[PDB]
């Protein structure tokens, strides 16, 4: 019971240190920058073939292929350039919540209420795509697993825990503990040396994959966090929570930098992504609309309308030439 | 060019995938999906004898396929994975009517499900289970329901009741009070987009499949009529 006083004192010390480090405001420092303007992105492709809501999608490193998952229990590999179904993998369980595309393009992964991140080999010698390894050990539902290389995959689960796996032996190598609520998303750093996570406790944490211990914690939200993305230079990240607000956090400063919100928006954010230059922030909302934010001025640059039901997933290509958005109406759209 | 072979192969693969997807869509649409809910120790696992996202079940009545699911391997918190069932035909709710201690928890869970944003257009089939145990408790008359629900002391059996022959007035009154407790929340809001179908079940019952069949038929018919603005 005495430890509560020490915890409160440490929290007060951290808050005071941050307040001291708060020299100025990003809005002030970027006051004189000319506004980005008005963005008028228009739909270029529409991908049909899913029977139910689409929950997740992911781009390949070649900026042409992508994968998606839906409640009907199917993974479809698309060719965005020339709309074509390269693969259609039927899953054992129809409740799938995430998909991943390996950087090498040889494997994809998915998982859901089955508490498993299954891995499929897209380069079988026989020619028929089949499941390669099934990873068991998580207790709650599997909300995200993202590839590190052809042999390592990071995972987050609804039991308030992440993990690092060894696909060859299918054994957990590291367990990341400390979150109080269900971990909903994670983002790898470009240097593949750290990653951040967001959970249903209005907090996000910075992890060290090689070490296995939390380095920093960020708390500036009011409700659960559903999405998280990493800045291109790996020195900041953005989050989206149920309080209808996205915030930008900096690792070195250890604080939130700016808040993107509008009084007319009272819907939670389901996805966030960054443009290649890191100037535009794209967020998906429950009102069937996706907004584009000036990441340096918190001004609504533009809107991405044209989805019927709730928009659930977002993505920007590695070359940063297009944006893909999936939604509960079972359609994916590519935006120039 | 000499690269038309790539396009030919891609088109052929897409055609085969679409051909399979057509049959997949037919099968997917021909079947109805149900979500099974309820607290522990409630008969949830034995409501339907099954003699025909973690626990699955399949049964057929009159050659109509059904698919039931039970999310029984998660944490206590359910405000996130519950959203993944916003397009099911119906929600089947099983409540132990003889557990006065947990009746309030069951009522609160039902209210949350009914008032949830993403579940605002789902009808609920309410199975009030363990009627023999409730009758035994009432007949023994050692624990009074008024201890937990003070308003029970001024509740009278509805005129429209259909007591089963031989059932005591006391047991009928308690049973119908329990049912009305849920019905009050069910009718307190909804705008007519969904309704509740209360039922009185027993552990040794076997008619539950037919009851679910009839309730689903009624739900779909009402949906169509509302679509045409009839209702």
């Amino acid at each position: 019971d005495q430890l509560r006083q020490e915890a409160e004192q440490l929290k007060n010390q951290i808050r005071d240190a941050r307040k001291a480090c708060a020299d100025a405001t990003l809005s002030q420092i970027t006051n004189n920058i000319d506004p980005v303007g008005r963005i008028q992105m228009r739909t270029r492709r529409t991908l049909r073939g899913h029977l139910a809501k689409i929950y997740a999608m992911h781009w390949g490193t070649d900026s042409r292929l992508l994968v998606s998952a839906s409640q009907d229990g199917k993974l479809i590999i698309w060719d965005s350039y020339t709309t074509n179904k390269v693969h259609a993998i039927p899953l054992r369980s129809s409740w799938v919540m995430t998909c991943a595309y390996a950087p090498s393009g040889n494997y994809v992964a998915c998982g859901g209420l089955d508490n498993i991140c299954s891995i499929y080999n897209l380069k079988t010698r026989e020619g028929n795509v089949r499941v390669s390894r099934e990873l068991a050990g998580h207790t709650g539902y599997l909300s995200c697993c993202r590839f590190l290389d052809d042999n390592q995959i990071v995972t987050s689960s609804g039991d308030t825990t992440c993990a690092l796996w060894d696909i060859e032996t299918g054994q957990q190598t590291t367990t990341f503990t400390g979150h109080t609520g269900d971990v909903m998303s994670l983002s790898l750093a470009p240097d593949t040396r750290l990653f951040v996570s967001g959970a249903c406790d209005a907090s996000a944490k910075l992890w060290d994959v090689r070490e296995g211990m939390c380095r920093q914690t960020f708390t500036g939200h009011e409700s659960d966090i559903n999405a998280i993305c990493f800045f291109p230079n790996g020195n900041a990240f953005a989050t989206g929570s149920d309080d209808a607000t996205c915030r930008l956090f900096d690792l070195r400063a250890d604080q939130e930098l700016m808040t993107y919100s509008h009084d007319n928006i009272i819907c939670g954010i389901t996805s966030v992504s960054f443009s290649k230059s890191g100037r535009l922030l794209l967020a998906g909302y429950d009102d069937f609309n996706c907004n584009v934010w000036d990441a340096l001025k918190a001004d609504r640059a533009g809107v991405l309308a044209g989805h019927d039901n709730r928009v659930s997933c977002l993505g920007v290509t590695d070359d940063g030439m297009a944006v893909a958005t999936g939604s509960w109406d079972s359609f994916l759209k590519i935006w120039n | 060019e000499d690269q038309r072979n790539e396009e030919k192969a891609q088109r052929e693969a897409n055609k085969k995938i679409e051909k399979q997807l057509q049959k997949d869509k037919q099968v997917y649409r021909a079947t109805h999906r149900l979500l099974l809910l309820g607290a522990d120790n409630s008969g949830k696992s034995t409501i339907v004898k099954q003699m025909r996202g973690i626990f699955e079940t399949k049964f057929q009545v009159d050659k109509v396929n059904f698919h039931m699911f039970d999310v029984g391997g998660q944490r206590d918190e359910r405000r996130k994975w519950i959203q993944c069932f916003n397009d099911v035909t119906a929600i089947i709710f099983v409540v132990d009517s003889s557990d006065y201690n947990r009746l309030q928890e069951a009522l609160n869970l039902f209210k949350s499900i009914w008032n949830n944003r993403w579940l605002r257009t789902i009808s609920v089939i309410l199975f009030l289970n363990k009627q023999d145990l409730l009758a035994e408790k009432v007949l023994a008359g050692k624990s009074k329901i008024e201890d937990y629900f003070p308003e029970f002391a001024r509740y009278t059996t509805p005129e429209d009741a259909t007591p089963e022959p031989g059932e005591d007035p006391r047991v009928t009154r308690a049973k119908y009070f329990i049912r009305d407790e849920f019905l009050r929340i069910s009718t307190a809001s909804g705008d007519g987009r969904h309704y509740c179908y209360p039922h009185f079940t027993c552990a040794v019952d076997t008619e539950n499949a037919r009851r679910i069949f009839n309730d689903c038929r009624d739900i779909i018919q009402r949906m169509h009529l509302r679509q045409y603005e009839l209702l």
Partner: nanobody
Amino acid sequence: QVQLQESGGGLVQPGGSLRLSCAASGFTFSNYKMNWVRQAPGKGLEWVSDISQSGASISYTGSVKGRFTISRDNAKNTLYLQMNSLKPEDTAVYYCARCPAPFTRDCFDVTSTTYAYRGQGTQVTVSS
């Protein structure tokens, strides 16, 4: 950032009176539904009462109806619970819980020592 600290509580004789307070910070108080929950020894969490954003709609469990009253003040970010005629069966730790999301009427906040928007709890004991 989100914090709920509960004042009040202590020792009292049967049939007495008591008042609890829960000062909140780290979120917009006016946009959320607040509840009171308690845990008697050897038992799980049980929902006691809740109040709406504006204070229009209120609800009480059967065991405490007519004896407890729940009040809300939005200009000070304080949640109250007036306990009267409290019986010996009211001995428990009384937590002050907030519903997960704003502008809604639904909550799942009796999770086993898991809910993150719930306070530390204050002891209330009734005895001779």
